[PDB]
Subunit: 357 residues, 4 copies
């Protein structure tokens, strides 16, 4: 009944506290011992500013939102997990009653309680020992899927939701903008879903080489080389069918619009700091479709975990994409702040994982 | 075998010429005596600059693209029209062979030969006496549908294609931006298709009153009053479900994005002069969908004509929307240049129609 | 805290009992005084056999499933209804947790607790005084929408769900098979949604005349006249675009398949007693699509109530379809069994309504 | 200018004739030397009866419809093939003008001129030396894709069109009924498109073992073992998501409906001799969707050829599915009738290929 936690109290203040362990109350409730936890731009954002958009921090918040754990207790009504399963954690829990939820878009639930987002008490975070989640928001991990990759499920589901919105199908030609963690996993999904070509675009040659090395990308393109024609030439002349915009920057959005084929599908997952200059008219003349993608929805976690399942079922040696390279740093729970400053400093970590207490 | 025509030779030079009448060649070909012709921003655009985007004028071009006529000759294989029917004219003819055509999107045919667009000879224009069109690109006009409204079919099909892309259905709440001709007809389609609310937004009080007067709009809003909350208040508190952007201006695009409901559908039909500042991130966080709409496609003309059919079948007195008010000026073929300068001067004409020779 | 109820105990045994009134427990719970209640083939089915399919009766069941009432009590969290609103009742409540619910298809919830269906205690029925329902499963009734029509919402939602599955849109040509209550309301939806033609098919000339009289059908056809060609001729030569099969009988299914246009949409809402002889190959050669329709889903009730709203907003005198003719008998709660035997005997009632205690 | 051909004159009469070689006329026309040709149930059907449905034979018909050849001549306007490419042949050519064609469904063109179907002269067949086809109805064959498999493209496209109608996507669980050529290729598509499970069902243990051996099926089930529960048990407990019905027989259609998950997608590609007994009501209660699949449409051939492309790009040794086993017999053009009687006798050939003259 004791629970150590990483906590962000105020700006640049991260401390280790110890709260009461969450207790099971609902019959579908499940208690999970968090073992791994990922880190992204949103974790350092609250650390540096305490505000993303209008999400603003007003109380001691418990941290962490890309985690995987082990079931340690279940309620009466749990039928999909026993005590002792490895689970990926879907951090955002919806109301199940609103019209967004009822329509199959708990995605956009206005009462969405997300892990490690502020604002009535603060929705709990996963950088603790004991996390409480409903049964249907944990995905059982296959035996060959690492407890590490369970933390990688969260940014992978973001890419699954996006490629689904873009209706990525066999023989497609997808252009993913941004060779960061999300943009890398997104390219891995497109190729997994059967795309004949997956070109990854960014300005870091190191990140582009990794895209090609893990096998998630068939082509790469450095966007300081030129415009749309060179991107097409770098793609073997194939003109992109879907554009997965994971960057949120004008030069990438602009480049993705000139390059994409008429009638192509353009998914927006990257977030800008504000408004951006947009080529609105060529968008119209090409009859493009812009999909705003926000986090992940129904079946997205299970689908992402299943990507790990089939990718690694015949051994890491025979795995078609080497997702584990996305882990460049590993830290114990004691060294958590050494990990946050590490990612805050941008030392060259694509993804950093922290163990549980 | 003699055909008078309105012709734009060079900038600000519009003259009356007389060319050879088009002759039937293909078995599906149909000759049409053009009787009415509409006028829009694109007609005055070529008049003033001779260039829209990269469509640039290099030869004497025959003018006109929103017309209706009477069948005066048919080929052997014509089975849907006899000599003497009233027809609306779909001005853009595609190749039928390319992958855009074959996929049901002759819309985006790269070989699209549109009427009164330059660039091999110039695709013919409708401001003449005898126009040549394939059989499947004319729509027979019901007896109660005016030969005038047949010219109005062209900007109405633009609104039909747009509301279809937006999947406008019963009980929807649509916000149309721009109370011009296209934006007016677009609102008429949304209400026709069963929208519970159709609010029209612009800055001209005259144009907003006309939207409400012809019955195409249930609400109106002048966009100098305020932002999204006032637009919602002007809509009876109903939050918009679909946004039909017929303006192409930043303040309207910006306003349509804050106002629209999460998961709403946003159709872009207005064209900007260049790039525009876009709220790309709230677009993502709301999981909106942006549809680029470009002209009209399969079944769009027939659907628009059918809107005239059912609107006017039980008499103009019982017609639910008074489309004829959209005709504020009428001109004979001799007074064509007096009509072009009239619309060029912006005297207050919503739509101006010119008779055939 | 006293609640009289109509109850079916065993076959042919219907009695009046008095149980304890349901009490509010959940914060979203709402107590409703049932004022009107409809009757259909399923109510008499359990009366005559006590079994529909594998739904079999094993305990005293409280009866009724097409009702409308008045709010008499609310919980803390209710925000969409105050004490005293007129509501239509959606009788089937889902679990909100299963994958069918989470995907936006509470429709197919395997834990669906429907009103007046057996099989742990029996889900309550509406033929009582005080009914308990969650807030989001009641639809507030506009002031001009009769408390009677609120009971008619249930079979109307069945038709809304069906026409949505069939993607009924403007200018469509719909053929509804079966001029009973459901088939009549289904035709009213198709015409409401903008169908250019709605032909109703059955063998009762009385029922066909009513379809045309209330204005829900533009054409009618008696299926003992002939086959598909006569059905087309009866439709003004227009070939059907959507087929709404509300009958469940072979001759109607067979006729709907020959008549429908290639690529047409065929919705199956009628239920057969067992397997039926089906023209499976012409189905394939025409590239038809068969939609199994089962009850109603998200937004279907609100949409049906909205059909009443807009149909009757400018007065019964100006209402485009006269839904009230569907009420041919009215009974007080005391005379409930006189009403069940009346509909059991098939005296000529299209829909019969019973008041609450 | 001389062209030998296999010809079916009357029932059981197949002879070798020599007609005039087809000459290029249209600028998009292409002349092809047919090198391989497949054989299916439709070829022997016309041989035995001279009638499929209402397709009835009234003249000497030139035979063959599953072929691949080599370009030997092109017209002026050909831009996608040079003289000397290996091509798969799409045998059915549409009008490009009708509403089915214009809507992107040349599939259902009422003027469809298919190869080796009767009824104005007889549309030509591919069992000759020189075949004439438009440019956009040939698919260039990658260098590693056998000229044999080009003949296999035709029954593979049938499976591509079907799995597309069923929206087969990653992680799906597909049940294909019928382990014949079409049903085998259909299973290969489902697994290719990313299905987590592809169970093939038939009554021939030989054919089921081949499904599993070429790797197109993860599970198999012999339908004389039992009903739906055993089919699920044979599938590892996974309940089917899509059902691909390639058989046209009642016991398979019946079994596919009980087995499929609620809301599942059921594609009908097999053809019955007449009407069949159908479980119409469980279809409704499960909210299934029945897709009639008829031949193949836009992009289906290119997609099928691309399946060969990616399947064999890293060598037959590393190919994930061994499509070539589907060729159990090979014949020269002289021994064509020995091949037709061979397949007519049902000696055990899954697919038989005949060389060109
Ligand atoms: Zn993150
Ligand atoms: Zn919610
Ligand atoms: Zn125009
Ligand atoms: Zn084209
Ligand atoms: Zn009922
Ligand atoms: Zn449920
Ligand atoms: Zn075949
Ligand atoms: Zn055609």
């Amino acid at each position: 009944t004791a629970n150590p936690s990483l906590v962000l109290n105020k700006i640049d203040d991260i401390s280790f506290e110890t709260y009461d362990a969450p207790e099971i109350s609902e019959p579908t409730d499940v208690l999970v011992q968090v073992k791994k936890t990922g880190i992204c731009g949103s974790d350092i954002h609250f650390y540096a500013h305490g505000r993303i958009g209008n999400f603003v921090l007003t109380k001691p918040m418990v941290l962490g939102h890309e985690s995987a754990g082990t079931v340690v207790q279940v309620g009466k009504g749990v039928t999909s997990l026993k005590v002792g399963d490895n689970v990926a954690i879907e951090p955002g829990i919806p109301c199940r009653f609103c019209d967004e939820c009822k329509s199959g878009h708990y995605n956009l639930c206005p009462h969405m309680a997300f892990a490690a987002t502020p604002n009535e008490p603060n929705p709990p975070g996963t950088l603790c020992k004991y996390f409480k989640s409903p049964e249907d928001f944990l995905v059982k991990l296959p035996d060959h899927v690492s407890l590490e990759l369970g933390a990688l499920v969260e940014p992978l589901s973001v890419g699954v939701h996006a490629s689904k919105l873009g209706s990525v199908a066999f023989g497609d030609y997808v252009a993913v903008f941004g060779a960061g963690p999300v943009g890398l996993l997104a390219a891995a999904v497109a190729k997994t879903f059967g795309a004949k070509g997956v070109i990854v675009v960014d300005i870091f040659d190191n990140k582009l080489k990794m895209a090609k090395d893990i096998g998630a990308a068939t082509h790469t393109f450095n966007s300081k080389t030129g415009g749309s024609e060179e991107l097409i030439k770098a793609f073997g002349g194939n003109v992109p069918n879907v554009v997965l915009e994971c960057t949120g920057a004008e030069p990438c959005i602009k480049l993705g619009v000139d390059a994409i084929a008429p009638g192509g599908r353009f998914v927006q997952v990257g977030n800008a700091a504000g408004p951006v200059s947009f080529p609105i008219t060529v968008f119209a003349m090409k009859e493009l479709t812009l999909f705003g993608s926000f986090r992940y929805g129904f079946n997205d976690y299970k689908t992402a975990v299943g990507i790990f399942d089939t990718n690694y079922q015949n051994g890491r040696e025979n795995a078609p994409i080497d997702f584990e390279q996305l882990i460049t740093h590993r830290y114990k729970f004691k060294d958590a702040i050494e990990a946050y400053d590490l990612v805050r400093a941008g030392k060259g970590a694509v993804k950093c994982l922290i163990d549980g207490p």
